[PDB]
Coordinates of C-alpha atoms in Angstrom, one line a residue:
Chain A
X296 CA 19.8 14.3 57.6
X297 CA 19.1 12.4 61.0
X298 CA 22.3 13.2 62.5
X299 CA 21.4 16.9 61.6
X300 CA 18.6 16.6 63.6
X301 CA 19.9 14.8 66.8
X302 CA 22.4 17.5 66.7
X303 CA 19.9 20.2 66.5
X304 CA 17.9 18.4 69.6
X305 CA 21.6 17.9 71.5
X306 CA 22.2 21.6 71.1
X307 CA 19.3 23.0 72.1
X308 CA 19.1 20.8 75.3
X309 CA 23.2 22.3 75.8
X310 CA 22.9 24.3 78.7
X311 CA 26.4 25.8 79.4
X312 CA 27.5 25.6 75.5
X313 CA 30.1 23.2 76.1
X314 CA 28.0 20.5 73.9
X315 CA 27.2 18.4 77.3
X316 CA 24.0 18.2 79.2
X317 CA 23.0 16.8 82.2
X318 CA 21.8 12.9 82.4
X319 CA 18.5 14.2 84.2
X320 CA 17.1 16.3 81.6
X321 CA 18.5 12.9 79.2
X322 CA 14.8 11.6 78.7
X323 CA 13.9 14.7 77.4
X324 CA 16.0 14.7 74.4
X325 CA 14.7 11.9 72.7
X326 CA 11.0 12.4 74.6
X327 CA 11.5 15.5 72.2
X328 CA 12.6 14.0 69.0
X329 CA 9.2 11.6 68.7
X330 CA 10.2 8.5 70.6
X331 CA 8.3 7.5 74.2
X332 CA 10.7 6.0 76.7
X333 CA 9.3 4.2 79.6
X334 CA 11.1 4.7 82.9
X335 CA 13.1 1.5 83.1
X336 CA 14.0 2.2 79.7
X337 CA 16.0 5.6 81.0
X338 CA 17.6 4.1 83.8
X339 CA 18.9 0.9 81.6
X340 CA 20.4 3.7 78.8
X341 CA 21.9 6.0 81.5
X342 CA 23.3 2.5 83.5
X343 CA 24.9 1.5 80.0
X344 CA 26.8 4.4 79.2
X345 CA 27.0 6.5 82.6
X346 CA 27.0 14.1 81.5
X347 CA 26.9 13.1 78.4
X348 CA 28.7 14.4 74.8
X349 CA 27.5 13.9 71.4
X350 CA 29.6 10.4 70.5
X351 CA 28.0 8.1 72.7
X352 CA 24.5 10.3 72.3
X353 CA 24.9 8.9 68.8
X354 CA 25.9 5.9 70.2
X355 CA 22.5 5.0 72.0
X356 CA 20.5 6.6 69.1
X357 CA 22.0 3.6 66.9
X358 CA 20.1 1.1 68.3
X359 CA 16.6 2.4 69.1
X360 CA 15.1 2.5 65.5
X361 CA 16.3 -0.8 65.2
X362 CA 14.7 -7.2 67.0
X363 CA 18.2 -7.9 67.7
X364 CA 18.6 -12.0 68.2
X365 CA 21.1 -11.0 71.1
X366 CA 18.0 -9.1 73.0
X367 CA 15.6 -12.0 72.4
X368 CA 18.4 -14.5 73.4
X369 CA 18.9 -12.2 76.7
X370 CA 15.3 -12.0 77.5
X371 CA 14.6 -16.0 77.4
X372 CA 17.6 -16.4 79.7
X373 CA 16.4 -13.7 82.5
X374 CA 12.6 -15.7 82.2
X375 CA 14.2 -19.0 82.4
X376 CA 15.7 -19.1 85.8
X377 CA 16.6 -22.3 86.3
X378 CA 18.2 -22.3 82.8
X379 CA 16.7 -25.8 81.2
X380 CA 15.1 -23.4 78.3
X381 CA 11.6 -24.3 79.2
X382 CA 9.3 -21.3 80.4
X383 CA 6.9 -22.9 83.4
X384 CA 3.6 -21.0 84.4
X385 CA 5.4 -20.6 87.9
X386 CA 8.8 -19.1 86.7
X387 CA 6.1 -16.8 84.3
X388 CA 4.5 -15.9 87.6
X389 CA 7.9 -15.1 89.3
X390 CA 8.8 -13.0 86.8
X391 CA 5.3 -10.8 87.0
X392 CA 5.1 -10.6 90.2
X393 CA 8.9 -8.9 90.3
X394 CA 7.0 -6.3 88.0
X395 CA 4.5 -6.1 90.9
X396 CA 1.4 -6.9 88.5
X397 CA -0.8 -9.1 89.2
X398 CA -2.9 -12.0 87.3
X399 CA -4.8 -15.3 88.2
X400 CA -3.5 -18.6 87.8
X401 CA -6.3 -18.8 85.2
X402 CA -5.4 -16.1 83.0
X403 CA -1.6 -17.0 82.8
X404 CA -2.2 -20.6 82.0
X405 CA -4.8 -19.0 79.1
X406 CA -1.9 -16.9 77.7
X407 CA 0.6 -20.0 78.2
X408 CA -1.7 -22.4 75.8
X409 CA -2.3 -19.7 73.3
X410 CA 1.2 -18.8 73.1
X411 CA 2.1 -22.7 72.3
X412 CA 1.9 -24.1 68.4
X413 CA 3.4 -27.9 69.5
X414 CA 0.5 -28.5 72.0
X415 CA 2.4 -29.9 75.0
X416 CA 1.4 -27.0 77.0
X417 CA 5.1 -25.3 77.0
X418 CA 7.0 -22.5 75.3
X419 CA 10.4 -23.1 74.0
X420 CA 13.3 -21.0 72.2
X421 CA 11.9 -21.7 68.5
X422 CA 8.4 -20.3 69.7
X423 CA 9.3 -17.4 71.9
X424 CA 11.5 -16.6 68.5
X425 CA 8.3 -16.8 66.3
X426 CA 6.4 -15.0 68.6
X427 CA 9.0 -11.9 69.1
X428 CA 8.7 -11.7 65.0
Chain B
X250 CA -31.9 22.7 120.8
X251 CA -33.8 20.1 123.2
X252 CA -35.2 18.4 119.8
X253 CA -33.7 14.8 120.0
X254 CA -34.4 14.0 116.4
X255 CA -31.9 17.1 115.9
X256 CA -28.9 15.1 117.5
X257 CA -29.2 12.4 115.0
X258 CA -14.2 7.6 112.4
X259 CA -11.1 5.4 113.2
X260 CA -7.6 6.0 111.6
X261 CA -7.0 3.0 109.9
X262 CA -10.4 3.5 107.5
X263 CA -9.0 7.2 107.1
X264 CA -6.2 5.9 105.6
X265 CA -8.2 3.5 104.0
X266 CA -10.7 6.0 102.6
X267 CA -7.2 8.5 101.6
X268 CA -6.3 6.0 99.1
X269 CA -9.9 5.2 97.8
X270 CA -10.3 8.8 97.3
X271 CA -6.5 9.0 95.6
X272 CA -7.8 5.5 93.4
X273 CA -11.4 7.3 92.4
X274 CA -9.4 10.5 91.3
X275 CA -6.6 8.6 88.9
X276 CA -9.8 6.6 87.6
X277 CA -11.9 9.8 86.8
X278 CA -8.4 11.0 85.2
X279 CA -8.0 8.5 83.1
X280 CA -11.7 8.4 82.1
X281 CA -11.1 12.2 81.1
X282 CA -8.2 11.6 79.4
X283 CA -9.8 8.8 77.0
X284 CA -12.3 11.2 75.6
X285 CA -9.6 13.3 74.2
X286 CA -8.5 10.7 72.3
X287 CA -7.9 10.8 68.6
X288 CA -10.6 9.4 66.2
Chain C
X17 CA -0.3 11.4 93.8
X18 CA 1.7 9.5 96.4
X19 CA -1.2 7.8 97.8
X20 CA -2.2 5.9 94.9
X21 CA -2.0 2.2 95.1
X22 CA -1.8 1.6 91.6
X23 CA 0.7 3.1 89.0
X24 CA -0.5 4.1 85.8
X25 CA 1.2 2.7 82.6
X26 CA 3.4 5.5 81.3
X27 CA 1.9 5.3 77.0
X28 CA -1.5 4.0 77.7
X29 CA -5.1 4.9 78.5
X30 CA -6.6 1.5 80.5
X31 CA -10.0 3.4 81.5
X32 CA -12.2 3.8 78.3
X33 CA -15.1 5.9 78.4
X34 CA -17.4 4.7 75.3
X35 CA -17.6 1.1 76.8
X36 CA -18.1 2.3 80.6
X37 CA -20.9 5.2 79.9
X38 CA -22.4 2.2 78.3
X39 CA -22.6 -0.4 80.9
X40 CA -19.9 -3.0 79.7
X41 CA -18.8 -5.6 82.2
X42 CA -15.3 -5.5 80.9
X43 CA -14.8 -1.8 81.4
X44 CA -15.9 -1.3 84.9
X45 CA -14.2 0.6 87.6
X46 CA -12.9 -2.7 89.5
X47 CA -12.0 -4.0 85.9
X48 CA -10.0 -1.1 85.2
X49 CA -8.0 -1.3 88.6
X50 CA -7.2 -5.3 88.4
X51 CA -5.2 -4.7 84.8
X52 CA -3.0 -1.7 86.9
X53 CA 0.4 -3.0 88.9
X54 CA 0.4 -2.2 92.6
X55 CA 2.9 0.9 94.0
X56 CA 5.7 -1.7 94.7
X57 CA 6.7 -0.4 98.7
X58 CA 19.9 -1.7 92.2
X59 CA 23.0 -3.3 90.3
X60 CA 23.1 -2.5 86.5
X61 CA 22.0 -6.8 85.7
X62 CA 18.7 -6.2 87.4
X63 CA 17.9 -3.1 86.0
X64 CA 18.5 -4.5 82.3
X65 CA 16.4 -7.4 83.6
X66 CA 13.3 -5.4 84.9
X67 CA 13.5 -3.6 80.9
X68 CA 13.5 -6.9 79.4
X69 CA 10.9 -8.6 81.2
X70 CA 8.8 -5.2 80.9
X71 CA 9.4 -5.4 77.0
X72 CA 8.7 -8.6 76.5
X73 CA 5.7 -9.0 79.0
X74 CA 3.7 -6.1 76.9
X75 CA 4.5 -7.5 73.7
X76 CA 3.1 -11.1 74.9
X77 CA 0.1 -9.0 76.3
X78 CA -0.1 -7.0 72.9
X79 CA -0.5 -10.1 71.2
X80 CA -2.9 -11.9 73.8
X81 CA -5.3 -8.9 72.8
X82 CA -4.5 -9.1 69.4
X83 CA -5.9 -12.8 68.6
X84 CA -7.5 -13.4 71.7
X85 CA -10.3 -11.9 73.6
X86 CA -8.8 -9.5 76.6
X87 CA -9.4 -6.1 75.1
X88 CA -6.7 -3.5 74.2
X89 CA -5.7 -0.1 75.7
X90 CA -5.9 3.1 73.6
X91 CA -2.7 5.2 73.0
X92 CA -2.1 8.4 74.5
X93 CA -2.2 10.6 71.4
X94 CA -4.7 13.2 72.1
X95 CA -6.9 15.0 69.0
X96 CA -6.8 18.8 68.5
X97 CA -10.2 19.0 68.3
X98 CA -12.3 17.9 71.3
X99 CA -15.0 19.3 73.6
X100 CA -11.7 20.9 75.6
X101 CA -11.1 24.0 73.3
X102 CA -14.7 25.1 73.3
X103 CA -14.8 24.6 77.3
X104 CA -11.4 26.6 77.6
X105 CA -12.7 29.8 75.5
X106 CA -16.1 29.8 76.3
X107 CA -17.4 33.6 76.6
X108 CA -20.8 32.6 78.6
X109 CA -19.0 32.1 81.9
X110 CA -15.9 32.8 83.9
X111 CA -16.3 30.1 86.8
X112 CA -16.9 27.4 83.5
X113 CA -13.4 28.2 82.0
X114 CA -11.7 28.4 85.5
X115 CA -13.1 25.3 86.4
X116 CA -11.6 23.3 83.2
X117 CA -8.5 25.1 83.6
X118 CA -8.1 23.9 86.9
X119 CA -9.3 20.4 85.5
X120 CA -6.7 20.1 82.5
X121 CA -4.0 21.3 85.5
X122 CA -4.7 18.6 87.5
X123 CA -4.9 16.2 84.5
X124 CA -1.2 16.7 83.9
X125 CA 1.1 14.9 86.6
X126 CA 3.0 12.1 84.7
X127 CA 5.2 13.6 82.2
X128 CA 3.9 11.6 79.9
X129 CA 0.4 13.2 80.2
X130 CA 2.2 16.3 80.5
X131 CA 3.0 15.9 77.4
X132 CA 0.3 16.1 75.2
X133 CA -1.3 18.4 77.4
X134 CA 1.0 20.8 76.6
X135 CA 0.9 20.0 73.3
X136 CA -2.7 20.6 72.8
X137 CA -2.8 23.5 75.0
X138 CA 0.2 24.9 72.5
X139 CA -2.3 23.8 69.8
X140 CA -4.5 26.3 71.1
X141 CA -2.4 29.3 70.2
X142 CA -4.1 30.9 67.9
X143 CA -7.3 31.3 69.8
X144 CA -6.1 33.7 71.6
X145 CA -7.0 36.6 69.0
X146 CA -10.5 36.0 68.9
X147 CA -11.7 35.5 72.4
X148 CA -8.9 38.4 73.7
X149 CA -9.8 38.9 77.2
X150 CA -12.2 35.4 77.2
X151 CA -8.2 33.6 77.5
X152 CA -7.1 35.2 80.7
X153 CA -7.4 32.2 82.5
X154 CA -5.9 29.9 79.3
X155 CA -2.7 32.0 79.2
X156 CA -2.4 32.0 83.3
X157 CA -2.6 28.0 82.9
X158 CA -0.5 28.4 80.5
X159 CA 2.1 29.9 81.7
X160 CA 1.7 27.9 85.0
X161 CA 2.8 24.2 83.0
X162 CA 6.3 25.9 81.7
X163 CA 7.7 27.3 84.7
X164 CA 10.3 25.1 84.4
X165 CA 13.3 25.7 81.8
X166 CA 13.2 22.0 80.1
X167 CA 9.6 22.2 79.2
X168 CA 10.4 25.6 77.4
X169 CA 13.5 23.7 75.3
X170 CA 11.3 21.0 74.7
X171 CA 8.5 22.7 73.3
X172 CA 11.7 25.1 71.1
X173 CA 12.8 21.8 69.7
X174 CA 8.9 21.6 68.5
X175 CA 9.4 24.8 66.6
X176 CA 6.8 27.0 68.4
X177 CA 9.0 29.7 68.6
X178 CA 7.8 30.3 64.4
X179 CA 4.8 29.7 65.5
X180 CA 4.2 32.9 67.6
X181 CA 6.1 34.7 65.2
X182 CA 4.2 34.4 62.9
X183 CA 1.0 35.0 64.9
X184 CA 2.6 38.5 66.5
X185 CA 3.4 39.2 62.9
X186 CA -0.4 38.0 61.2
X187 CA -1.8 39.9 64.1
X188 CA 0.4 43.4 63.7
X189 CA -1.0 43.3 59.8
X190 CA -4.1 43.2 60.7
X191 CA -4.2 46.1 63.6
X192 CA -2.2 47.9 60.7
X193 CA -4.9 47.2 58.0
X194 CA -7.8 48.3 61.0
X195 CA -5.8 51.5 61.2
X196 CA -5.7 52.4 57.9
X197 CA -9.6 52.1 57.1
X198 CA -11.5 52.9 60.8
X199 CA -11.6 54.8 63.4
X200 CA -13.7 52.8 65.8
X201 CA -12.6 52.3 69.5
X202 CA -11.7 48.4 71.3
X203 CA -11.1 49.1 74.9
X204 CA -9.1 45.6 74.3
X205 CA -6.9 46.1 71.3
X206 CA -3.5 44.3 71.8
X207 CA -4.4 42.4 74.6
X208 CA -3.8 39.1 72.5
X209 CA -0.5 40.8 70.8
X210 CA 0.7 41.7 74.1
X211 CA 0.4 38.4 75.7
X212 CA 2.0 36.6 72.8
X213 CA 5.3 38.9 73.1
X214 CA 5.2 38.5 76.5
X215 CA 5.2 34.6 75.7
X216 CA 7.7 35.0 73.2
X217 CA 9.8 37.3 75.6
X218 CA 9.8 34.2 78.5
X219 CA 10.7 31.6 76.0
X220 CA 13.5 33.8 74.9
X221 CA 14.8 34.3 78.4
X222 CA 16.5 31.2 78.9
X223 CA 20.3 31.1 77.7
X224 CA 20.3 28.3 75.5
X225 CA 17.3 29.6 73.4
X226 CA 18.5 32.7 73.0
X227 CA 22.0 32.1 71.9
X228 CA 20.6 29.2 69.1
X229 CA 17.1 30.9 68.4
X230 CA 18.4 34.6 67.6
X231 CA 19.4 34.4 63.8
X232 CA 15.5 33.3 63.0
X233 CA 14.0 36.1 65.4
X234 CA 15.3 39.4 64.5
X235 CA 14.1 40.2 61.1
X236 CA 10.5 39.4 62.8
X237 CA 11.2 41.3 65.7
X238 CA 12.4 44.3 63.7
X239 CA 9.3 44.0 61.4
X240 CA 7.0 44.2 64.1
X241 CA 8.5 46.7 65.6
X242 CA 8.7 49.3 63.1
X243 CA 4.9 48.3 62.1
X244 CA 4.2 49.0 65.7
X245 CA 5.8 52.6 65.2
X246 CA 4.2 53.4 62.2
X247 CA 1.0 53.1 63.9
X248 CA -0.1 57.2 64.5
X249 CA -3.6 56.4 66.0
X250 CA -5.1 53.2 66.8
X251 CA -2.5 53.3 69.7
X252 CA -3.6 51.8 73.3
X253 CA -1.4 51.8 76.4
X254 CA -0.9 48.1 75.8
X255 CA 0.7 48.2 72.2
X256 CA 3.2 51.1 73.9
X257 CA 3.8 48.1 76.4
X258 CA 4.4 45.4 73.3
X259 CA 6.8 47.9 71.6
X260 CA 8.5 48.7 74.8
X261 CA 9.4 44.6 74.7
X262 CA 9.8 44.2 71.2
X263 CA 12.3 47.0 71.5
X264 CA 14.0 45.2 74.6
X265 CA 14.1 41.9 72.5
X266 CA 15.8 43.9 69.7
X267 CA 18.4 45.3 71.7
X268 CA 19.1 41.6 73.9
X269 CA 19.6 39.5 71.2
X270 CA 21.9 42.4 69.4
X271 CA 24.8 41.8 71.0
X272 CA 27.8 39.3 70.4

């Protein structure tokens, strides 16, 4: 009954009729079906696939109501830059200050120590996995 | 007109005081905004 | 909007109101402004990193509020019932209902906000019957949000387009079932079912809408429309205007 549904949405967003649309009105499809998107979240689904047709709309609406281990694997590799597998408060701070948002060195070492069950003051794969859960 | 007591800005603070007034405005949106909310 | 130095989070409401009208610490204006990224002044492995990092940085935060002490944001999912509909359709004053009209325009800039705006304001459909003349300035604001075509498919995929059918049609039975018994005079009968076929009529005018919308519309078109003919003498200038257009939708979405 889902497919129905994304079909009804991908129609009514068809403007010429030739069951295609346009990748800038391609937020609003799924904005319209119940799901928020954030920004970076468009630009990563058009980069993946990209006018788009109904196979690979499918396509990325197979793996949004979905953690995948793959994801959580990909995100510990872009935080750990220099690839030992140990998260430090200045790769943490690297990595928020890309996003342009801003902390104090307290606050970051707070969330560092409460996000650590082995007490040594640093996260590892086996946390970041219980944590993601 | 000859009262004294009658007869009583750079560019960088306007710019300054721009964005303060564009800050104060998205604050008083968001504090509109969260008395809409859903209880 | 481009002069802001902070960029609002896209699903969530930082400022809240309750705390700050009561003097909180926590929920001051400088508060509010240091939990806010500043406007920052691209290959396809950066982008996938800036949405993983994103991701993973408010799920870390998510939990940091959770179990620890910094407080968490409310979710942009507005009520239908506020202090906003009784502003909007208040009969007391003109200035009072322009004013939050022009308030409630400005409040919707982001998409994001945009949508629920429109949402609620589309919630308020079915006010327009009772306060008739009192929602000139609703429907203008109205009107004003969905000038563009996608916002029109987006609220069709919502299923509004049943919605004002079946207020033209609740509406029609009751100027039929006013005819039949009075003979009183309302200098603004079918003001409120002339507006809503003119809404109706705008939401119809876009191509995609009409060719998927038209085998759902006709049988309350044609309804309406012969209602509207039967009528002999509780007839106003304005319902010859709504036939004239429910007659015009008849004949457009005929054909093919």
């Amino acid at each position: 009954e889902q497919i129905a549904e994304f079909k009804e949405a991908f129609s009514l967003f068809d403007k010429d009729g030739d069951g295609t649309i346009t990748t800038k009105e391609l937020g609003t499809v799924m904005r319209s079906l119940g799901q928020n998107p954030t920004e970076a979240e468009l630009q990563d689904m058009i980069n993946e696939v990209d006018t788009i047709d109904f196979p690979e709309f499918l396509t990325m609406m197979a793996r949004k109501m979905k953690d995948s281990e793959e994801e959580i694997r990909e995100a510990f590799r872009v935080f750990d830059k220099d690839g030992n597998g140990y998260i430090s408060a200045a790769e943490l701070r690297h990595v928020m200050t890309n996003l342009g948002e801003k902390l104090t060195d307290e606050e970051v070492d707070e969330m560092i120590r409460e996000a650590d069950i082995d007490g040594d003051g640093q996260v590892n794969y086996e946390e970041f996995v219980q944590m993601m859960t | 007109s000859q009262f004294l007591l009658t007869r009583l800005m750079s560019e960088t603070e306007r710019q300054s005081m721009e964005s303060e007034r564009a800050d104060r405005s998205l604050f008083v949106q968001e504090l509109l905004l969260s008395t809409l909310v859903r209880e | 909007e481009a002069l802001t130095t902070v960029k609002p989070y896209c699903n969530e409401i930082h400022a809240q109101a309750q705390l700050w009208l009561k003097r909180d610490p926590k929920a001051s204006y400088d508060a509010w402004k240091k939990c806010l990224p500043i406007r920052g002044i691209p290959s396809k492995s950066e982008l996938r990193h800036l949405y993983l990092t994103e991701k993973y940085v408010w799920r870390w935060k998510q939990f940091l509020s959770r179990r620890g002490k910094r407080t968490s944001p409310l979710d942009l999912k507005l009520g239908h019932n506020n202090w906003l509909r009784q502003v909007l359709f208040t009969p007391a004053t003109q200035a009072a209902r322009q004013a939050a009209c022009t308030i409630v325009e400005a409040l919707a800039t982001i998409p994001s906000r945009k949508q629920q705006v429109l949402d609620l304001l589309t919630s308020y459909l079915d006010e327009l019957s009772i306060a008739g003349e009192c929602a000139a300035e609703y429907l203008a604001l109205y009107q004003k949000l969905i000038t563009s075509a996608h916002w029109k498919v987006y609220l069709a995929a919502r299923g509004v387009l049943p919605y004002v059918g079946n207020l033209i049609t609740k509406e029609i039975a009751r100027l039929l079932a006013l005819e039949e018994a009075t003979l009183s005079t309302d200098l603004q009968q079918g003001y409120a079912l002339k507006s809503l076929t003119g809404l109706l009529s705008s939401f119809v005018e876009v191509e995609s809408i009409k060719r998927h919308f038209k085998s759902r519309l006709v049988g309350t078109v044609l309804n309406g429309y012969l209602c509207l003919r039967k009528l002999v003498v509780q007839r106003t200038k304005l319902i010859d205007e709504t036939q004239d257009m429910l007659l015009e939708m008849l004949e457009d979405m005929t054909t093919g």
